[PDB]
Amino acid sequence: SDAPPLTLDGIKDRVLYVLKLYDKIDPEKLSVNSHFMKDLGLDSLDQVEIIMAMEDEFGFEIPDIDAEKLMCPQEIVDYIADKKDVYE
Amino acid sequence: RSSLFAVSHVLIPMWFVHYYVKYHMATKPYTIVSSKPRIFPGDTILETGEVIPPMRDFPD
Amino acid sequence: AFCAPPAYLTHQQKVLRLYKRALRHLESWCIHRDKYRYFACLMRARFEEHKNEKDMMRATQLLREAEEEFWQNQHPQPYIFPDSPGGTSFERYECYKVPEWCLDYWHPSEKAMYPDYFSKREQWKKLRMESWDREVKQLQEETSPDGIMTEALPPARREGDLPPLWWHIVTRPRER
Amino acid sequence: HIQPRYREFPQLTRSQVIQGEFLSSLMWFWILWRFWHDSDAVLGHFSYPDPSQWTDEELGIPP
Amino acid sequence: LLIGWWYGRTDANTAALQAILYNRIGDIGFILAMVWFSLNMNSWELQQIMF
Amino acid sequence: GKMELPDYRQWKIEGTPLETVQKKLAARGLRDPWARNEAWRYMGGFAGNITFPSVILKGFKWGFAAFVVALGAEYFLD
Amino acid sequence: AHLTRRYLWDASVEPDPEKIPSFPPDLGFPERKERVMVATQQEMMDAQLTLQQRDYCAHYLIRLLKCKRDSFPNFLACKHEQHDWDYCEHLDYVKRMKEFERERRLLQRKKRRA
Amino acid sequence: KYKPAPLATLPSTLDPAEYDVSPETRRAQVERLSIRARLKREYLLQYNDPKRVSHIEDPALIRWTYARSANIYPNFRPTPKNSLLGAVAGFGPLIFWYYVFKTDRDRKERLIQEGKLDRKFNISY
Amino acid sequence: MLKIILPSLMLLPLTWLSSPKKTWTNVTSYSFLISLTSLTLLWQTDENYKNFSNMFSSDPLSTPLIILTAWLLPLMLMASQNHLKKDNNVLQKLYISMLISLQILLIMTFSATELIMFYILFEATLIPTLIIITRWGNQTERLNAGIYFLFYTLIGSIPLLIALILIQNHVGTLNLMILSFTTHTLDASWSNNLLWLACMMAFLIKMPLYGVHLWLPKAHVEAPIAGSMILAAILLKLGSYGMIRISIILDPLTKYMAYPFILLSLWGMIMTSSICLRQTDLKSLIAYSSVSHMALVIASIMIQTPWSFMGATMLMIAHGLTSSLLFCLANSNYERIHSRTMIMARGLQMVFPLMATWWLMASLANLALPPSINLMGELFITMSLFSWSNFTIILMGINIIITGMYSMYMIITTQRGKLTNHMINLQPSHTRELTLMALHMIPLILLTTSPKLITGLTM
Amino acid sequence: WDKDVYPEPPSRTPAPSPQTSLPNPITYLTKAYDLVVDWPVTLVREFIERQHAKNRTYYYHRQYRRVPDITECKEGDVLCIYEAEMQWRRDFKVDQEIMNIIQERLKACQQREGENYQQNCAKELEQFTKVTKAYQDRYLDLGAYYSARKCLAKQKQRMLEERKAARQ
Amino acid sequence: HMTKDMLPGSYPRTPEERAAAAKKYNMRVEDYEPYPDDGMGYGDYPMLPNRSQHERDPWYQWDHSELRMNWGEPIHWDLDMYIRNRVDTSPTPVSWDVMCKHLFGFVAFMVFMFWVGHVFPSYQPVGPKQYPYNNLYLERGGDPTKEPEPVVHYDI
Amino acid sequence: VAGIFLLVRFHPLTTNNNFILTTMLCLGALTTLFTAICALTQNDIKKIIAFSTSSQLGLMMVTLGMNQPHLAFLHICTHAFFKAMLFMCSGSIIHSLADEQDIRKMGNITKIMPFTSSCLVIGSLALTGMPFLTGFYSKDLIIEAINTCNTNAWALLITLIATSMTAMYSMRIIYFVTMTKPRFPPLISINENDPDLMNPIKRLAFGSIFAGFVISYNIPPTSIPVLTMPWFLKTTALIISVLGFLIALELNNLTMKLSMNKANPYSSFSTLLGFFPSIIHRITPMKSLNLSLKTSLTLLDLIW
Ligand SMILES: CCCCCCCCCCCCCCCCCC(=O)OC[C@H](COP(=O)(O)OCCN)OC(=O)CCCCCCCCCCCCCCCCC
Ligand SMILES: CCCCCCCCCCCCCCCCCC(=O)OC[C@H](COP(=O)(O)OCCN)OC(=O)CCCCCCCCCCCCCCCCC
């Protein structure tokens, strides 16, 4: 029943997946570095919602101090990798 | 496996325990004190070849 | 768990964190996803109704009132993710999170196995007694002489230099 | 052994379902056998006589 | 010893010590009973105590 | 092992309570940008309503069947 | 029920569970017979019964224990006996209920005598 | 509305000290953070420093132990309520318990002398 | 007895004219052989007691103290070994000689027949202890600690001497069992009340009463490990032996001239078990534990019942062993961290997973986990005091609770959190100290299996 | 084991009346036990008793001459007081064992009778009460430092009151 | 190694003393506040908020994590009771004044109602049970040689 | 069950003390109610099960006070089967998911995990009192004696209120863990096809089904029960369990309907445990410790 380990490409897939499911702005065009305010023009409230969706997806919390600095899927993937200790 | 485990983890201990009981716990007076066995009318005891008589006519 | 709080939180940060906590407690209260989405959209409308306002005094007042409303309508048994404070796994593997220096006391007949491992551990030290002196100067020289200081740290600006004070952020044990 | 599934209803082996169905069917068979043969234990087997339906001859009360 | 298996968790230990505390509070009465019986019956066995 | 992810072109609000919630949020004049995420459930193998009868009367079919079988066998054997 | 009839209505014309045999027994019974005992003290003591249990039905209880110790590997073979014991205990309960009603009727007599 | 207590304190949200924007507040916060960061830098220049064979000391812990242990009597001063707390705590309960035990013992002894007691099976003491 | 004392006297030359490499080994081995030979005293086939001379004697109460004294020696040798390791050969030979002298004098004063010989030895026990505490301590308050210890003891001991002279004059001897076969009742006068006070205060100080407990925590905290061990195990027992021996002639005064001390003991028990909750020094915590345990011994001697004396003896020996064990356990860490502060080092049981067991069992004993002699003593003291008066059970239960609290506190703030990962100097556990702990524990198992050797005079 | 010291009344065991046709495991299990546990252990104890029989040894129960009592023992002569006190301690220990025997005799009867211990376990309870009264009159309130002299003082402090009662 | 100038001392009666005390304890001379002078050994030791260690941030990577307390930070005189295995001052949605009232009310009402149900019990309408041989006088202890006060149990 | 075993072992002495039997009957019942209440607004399976255990223990203390020790012990023995299988299925579900015990993040177990769902339903029914699943053979007799004896007429009521809260929180478990939609994370690695997990539960379930029969039909009759009573006493346990199930169905379907959840003091009380811990574990330590420090160590020892 032990669940399988994580992979960087897996986290990429899942993050881009959630962001594609997102509707308010994202016109299904999201490169790994689709900055939310510059490249997509989102609000900090939308960013809050995004981080909470990432949490509900992966099963753990992002401290608000560190979530107030995530604006790119790549930054999200990097934080999650640092937390889960992946790519041994 | 079941059988070898049975032997080496039940029998040997069971032999030691039977020895201990029979020769250090029943040789002493009040170490194994059983309660008395229920007896009912008609139960013919065997230590005296006795027979206790049955009960009275049951009204009904 | 990776940065340090700033000397003071700004109104923006306060409001964002209030929004996050309010939504988490809305989730706690509403068990079903449809209900959660409904009332989350309602709450975000309540919020956006006062996003283009700028009077700082009235803003702080609205915030001081919203925090009281939150304290009055908060779920007392909210959902906490397991590995987070208040969760059923917070500080559960600290029993197995043994540090690295515990291997300097190992016995030759213990490192006799894993020999390829301990050879790397060695040169990871050679990479440390050399990279130490320049990590100090980079702090000495990058010091604010005007007194001001905070809990930040700079990277290395060279080819070969390493981030100052790395050995403990690197080398730390898995979470498992 | 199994293959993880994402946002889908996973593949279900036959043992884990047949065994649960068997246990449930056995529980209900037991309930039915019992409720058939020993219904009293949940309903009653000894009525509760109506007080004052007796006669003053019994429980003698002089006038 | 079992509530405390994860001796890094600072709440399992609180729970363990809670259990210890309450069960000592019960041991107070247990020892009171043992003392009363040892004095007024010169015994600690169910058999004598049944008198 | 390499994991796969199905296309996002199938998780649609249509035919679920998310759609009724959308009706209500439109009556009030609003939109939900996330419903398509929560809509992975509510459809597929996870579709359908489960009932307290559904969970309590599980096995009852074959239970009752074998009960009647044993009853007939008992009547036979006397 | 008696609960209401005592705690809300007249509480002095309703019996008290601890004073049931208070009045004389034969105030309405001529040559009131006794309750018989068809089980002997020895027959009841050699069976190792309990003092909450060696009441007027210990004879059927003796038959039950007998037919149980016998036919043992096959329990469920002690139903016809269990029924008899349950019935005698039910009849004892009936006698107790009738004693209660007797005393209540005598309280009615005392309240109607004045 | 939430009434704070010394055991269920007031949160940070409802603390009007928070949301204060006065410079006499923000400057103080910045100075506190600067002190905190200076101390953390000092401590991390010792944690990760190689060539360290020993452990790290805690002058704050040392100060705390020295205060709770040995800096007491040099600052002690007899005062009212101090002499009184001491005398009470020291003697009162002893007097209470003395009279409890003495009453009980005297009662038991007079009972035994009169023979009005039941000491059945007491053959140990 | 002389076959026990002469070899202990010969351990001295052995120590001094042994080479600088084999002195520890040889003296420890021969100390173990002495502990072995001391078991002749346990050959008691009759209710008659032993009398080898007009000067020596043994009883079911003095034999266990003597054997514990002869057993603790090699343990103290082993424990005082890591420290004073660099110190000069001459200095460490001095240390060994101090230990051996303590052994000999304690054996003598437990095997003595005359109160005045008992006195001169119970007062000669000061020189070696003072010297060990002042010459080998690490702080600067060990001097004041020795002052306190020495002078509390002497101030308590002078009137005892005067009372002994008064007796030697009224009666013609101070010999035990003659003071028994000739004892008389008294007049319940003030002179005899002061005689009681005199005879008692020395011992009520040497085993700390609540109000004069202000020499034990000092001495422990400031003394080395062997001093701590002997102080906790035997020097706290000299008073108990002395009172159990001197209370036979003071009848019938202790029926009413004992209330104050029973009160002080039953209250200071609580008031020290509570300090064991909020003390920061592990050594002072264990000292206050010793105090809270000796309070029971005092209150049980005061009431003079067989069960009481039995519990007193059991708890004496058990607490000796357990306190020595706990002190050595704290010393194992001190040798590695040089700080008695408990909350400093935490999260052990990760790098020292076995010593966390010894830590645990020493705690299971102190909190009286059955089956154990700590409990076989506490229980009987409780029963005796309940027969005395039923209201003692309240304070007994309070003390039980607080003990169960602070034992587990000491366990958890050292072995059951998460590690202070910044501790690079945690040299793994020495076979020597593991052996110390094993030698402390195993005898407790054996005395729990055969507690007939530990009941005492009455039984 | 002397049955007079330790009664152990007889056992009324009844006849097995298997009023059925289904077997009983316990019987065949007991037979298997007799065959695979008893037989060999019995043989081994027989062998050990053989070795004993061929190298027997005897040991005797020590007798103790009676010496003067405290009554004929002067008020300060210790050569006699030692003998008397040793004798008293000896008898005190034997009395301990007597009382323990009575209690070991009562527990067995309680366990045996079971629910009939309130009617069939009375003479043992009476012996217990009597020996308890005696132990109390002899040794109850002496103290840790008990001795023949304190026992004598107790005896006299009792007899003077009994004499007062007698005369009035 | 430390020194009498690094260790604590006595009550500061000048700002020349408050400055050194606060700079030693590593606080600022404004936030520093010594304990009142009631002759109790405190001396110049900081007086700090009576908040526990639960209040602090769990997400911060402290130095002393189990204590949630940094390295040179001044330590609360009552840490041993706030070490997070002990007293918790963290706030509560409900308030002391109302929670105590609710608990006391629940308990006291339930006790009062126990007494009400004791004054007015519940039972079934039957007479006492009947045991033949004088309520089993012999079996129930009794005395064989003596006789009991005979009692009778009638039919119906 | 250790204290209850103690009290049954010492039942020969509680038989003649109507002050002990009366504080039993008036205390055990005070827990059946006070814990079930707590078990109606908690979100953790483990806490729910523990509060239910405490309620059943209060019930056994009640039947001890009413002088039914053998019945209390029979309940002790018929309770272990299902109160162990429940923790068993709980732990199965948990280890299948990512170590989460909060029911608010699980669902559809009836379909994604048939085995543990079936076993959980069996345990819940046995606990509620279904006519023959090891619950009946003890709880029915207990709840018959409770009203057939002369007793305390407030315990006789709160005992049954709690006997209903039993089915209430059991239905809560069933509905929030095995009937609603999968509000758990999206990654799914469920696996319950390991014999070391399937066989133990199968075994404990056979137990939970047949142990009451096998025992009650072999043990001796050390107490005469009362099979003479009205239907509204003979069927009260079953009826009230059913009513609890139905009330729970209603109040849980009300969890839907898009009506926000206005917090209330009743629910806050039941959720925060009546504040017993939140207040006691804060005053008593503070007093004890401030005394230990400022009075004994400081004022007496180091000062005076
Ligand atoms: C910091 C603490 C204070 C330290 C300074 C100590 C100051 C010392 C006190 C000053 C001197 C006062 C004592 C004078 C002694 C008087 C003589 C006496 O009391 O002896 C009487 C008694 C024997 O009398 P008896 O045998 O009956 O017949 C007549 C004599 N053939 O024989 C006896 O009773 C012997 C009495 C010896 C003196 C006992 C002193 C009090 C004992 C209890 C306290 C002990 C602690 C140290 C003293 C504390 C202060 C008193
Ligand atoms: C009809 C009847 C109704 C009334 C019945 C009344 C029955 C008597 C009730 C007495 C019990 C109340 C006192 C119990 C004290 C419990 C203290 C405690 O709980 O310690 C644990 C506590 C942390 O626990 P917690 O608050 O749950 O924190 C969890 C965080 N997630 O915090 C701690 O870790 C503190 C650790 C121990 C602190 C030292 C304690 C010293 C001893 C003081 C308590 C004993 C006082 C005597 C209690 C009464 C018994 C005589």
PDB file of C-alpha atoms and ligand atoms in Angstrom, chain E residues 18 21-22, chain I residues 405, chain K residues 85-86, chain L residues 280-281 284-285 288, ligand 2:
ATOM      1  CA  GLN E  18      -1.228  12.057  31.452  1.00  0.00           C
ATOM      2  CA  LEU E  21      -0.730  10.631  36.327  1.00  0.00           C
ATOM      3  CA  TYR E  22      -4.334   9.437  36.251  1.00  0.00           C
TER       4      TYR E  22
ATOM      5  CA  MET I 405       5.702  12.848  37.889  1.00  0.00           C
TER       6      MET I 405
ATOM      7  CA  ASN K  85       5.045  19.637  27.527  1.00  0.00           C
ATOM      8  CA  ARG K  86       3.234  21.626  30.203  1.00  0.00           C
TER       9      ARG K  86
ATOM     10  CA  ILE L 280      -8.124  21.600  34.353  1.00  0.00           C
ATOM     11  CA  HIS L 281      -4.853  20.902  32.512  1.00  0.00           C
ATOM     12  CA  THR L 284      -3.835  22.513  38.165  1.00  0.00           C
ATOM     13  CA  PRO L 285      -0.342  22.541  36.578  1.00  0.00           C
ATOM     14  CA  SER L 288       1.138  23.000  41.517  1.00  0.00           C
TER      15      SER L 288
HETATM   16  C1  LIG M   2     -19.041  13.436  40.151  1.00  0.00           C
HETATM   17  C2  LIG M   2     -17.520  13.544  40.114  1.00  0.00           C
HETATM   18  C3  LIG M   2     -17.106  14.711  39.218  1.00  0.00           C
HETATM   19  C4  LIG M   2     -15.774  15.291  39.694  1.00  0.00           C
HETATM   20  C5  LIG M   2     -14.687  14.217  39.677  1.00  0.00           C
HETATM   21  C6  LIG M   2     -13.375  14.811  40.182  1.00  0.00           C
HETATM   22  C7  LIG M   2     -12.274  13.760  40.081  1.00  0.00           C
HETATM   23  C8  LIG M   2     -10.937  14.372  40.496  1.00  0.00           C
HETATM   24  C9  LIG M   2     -10.266  15.030  39.290  1.00  0.00           C
HETATM   25  C10 LIG M   2      -8.773  15.203  39.566  1.00  0.00           C
HETATM   26  C11 LIG M   2      -7.994  15.308  38.255  1.00  0.00           C
HETATM   27  C12 LIG M   2      -7.771  16.769  37.865  1.00  0.00           C
HETATM   28  C13 LIG M   2      -6.284  17.108  37.956  1.00  0.00           C
HETATM   29  C14 LIG M   2      -5.527  16.354  36.865  1.00  0.00           C
HETATM   30  C15 LIG M   2      -4.273  17.119  36.451  1.00  0.00           C
HETATM   31  C16 LIG M   2      -3.964  16.797  34.992  1.00  0.00           C
HETATM   32  C17 LIG M   2      -2.728  17.574  34.548  1.00  0.00           C
HETATM   33  C18 LIG M   2      -2.427  17.233  33.091  1.00  0.00           C
HETATM   34  O1  LIG M   2      -3.326  17.007  32.354  1.00  0.00           O
HETATM   35  O2  LIG M   2      -1.102  17.191  32.639  1.00  0.00           O
HETATM   36  C19 LIG M   2      -0.960  17.183  31.247  1.00  0.00           C
HETATM   37  C20 LIG M   2      -1.046  18.618  30.724  1.00  0.00           C
HETATM   38  C21 LIG M   2      -1.069  18.596  29.198  1.00  0.00           C
HETATM   39  O3  LIG M   2      -2.231  17.957  28.760  1.00  0.00           O
HETATM   40  P1  LIG M   2      -3.204  18.764  27.705  1.00  0.00           P
HETATM   41  O4  LIG M   2      -3.775  19.981  28.389  1.00  0.00           O
HETATM   42  O5  LIG M   2      -4.328  17.860  27.261  1.00  0.00           O
HETATM   43  O6  LIG M   2      -2.324  19.236  26.397  1.00  0.00           O
HETATM   44  C22 LIG M   2      -2.527  18.572  25.183  1.00  0.00           C
HETATM   45  C23 LIG M   2      -1.976  19.420  24.040  1.00  0.00           C
HETATM   46  N1  LIG M   2      -2.411  18.855  22.779  1.00  0.00           N
HETATM   47  O7  LIG M   2       0.019  19.429  31.154  1.00  0.00           O
HETATM   48  C24 LIG M   2       1.154  18.800  31.677  1.00  0.00           C
HETATM   49  O8  LIG M   2       1.876  18.187  30.965  1.00  0.00           O
HETATM   50  C25 LIG M   2       1.464  18.913  33.166  1.00  0.00           C
HETATM   51  C26 LIG M   2       2.371  17.763  33.596  1.00  0.00           C
HETATM   52  C27 LIG M   2       2.263  17.520  35.102  1.00  0.00           C
HETATM   53  C28 LIG M   2       2.294  18.844  35.863  1.00  0.00           C
HETATM   54  C29 LIG M   2       2.598  18.597  37.337  1.00  0.00           C
HETATM   55  C30 LIG M   2       1.350  18.079  38.050  1.00  0.00           C
HETATM   56  C31 LIG M   2       1.595  18.080  39.557  1.00  0.00           C
HETATM   57  C32 LIG M   2       0.499  17.291  40.267  1.00  0.00           C
HETATM   58  C33 LIG M   2      -0.778  18.128  40.338  1.00  0.00           C
HETATM   59  C34 LIG M   2      -1.986  17.283  39.942  1.00  0.00           C
HETATM   60  C35 LIG M   2      -2.411  16.381  41.101  1.00  0.00           C
HETATM   61  C36 LIG M   2      -3.289  17.149  42.087  1.00  0.00           C
HETATM   62  C37 LIG M   2      -4.285  16.191  42.736  1.00  0.00           C
HETATM   63  C38 LIG M   2      -5.454  15.930  41.787  1.00  0.00           C
HETATM   64  C39 LIG M   2      -6.654  15.401  42.571  1.00  0.00           C
HETATM   65  C40 LIG M   2      -6.326  14.045  43.188  1.00  0.00           C
HETATM   66  C41 LIG M   2      -6.172  14.197  44.698  1.00  0.00           C
END
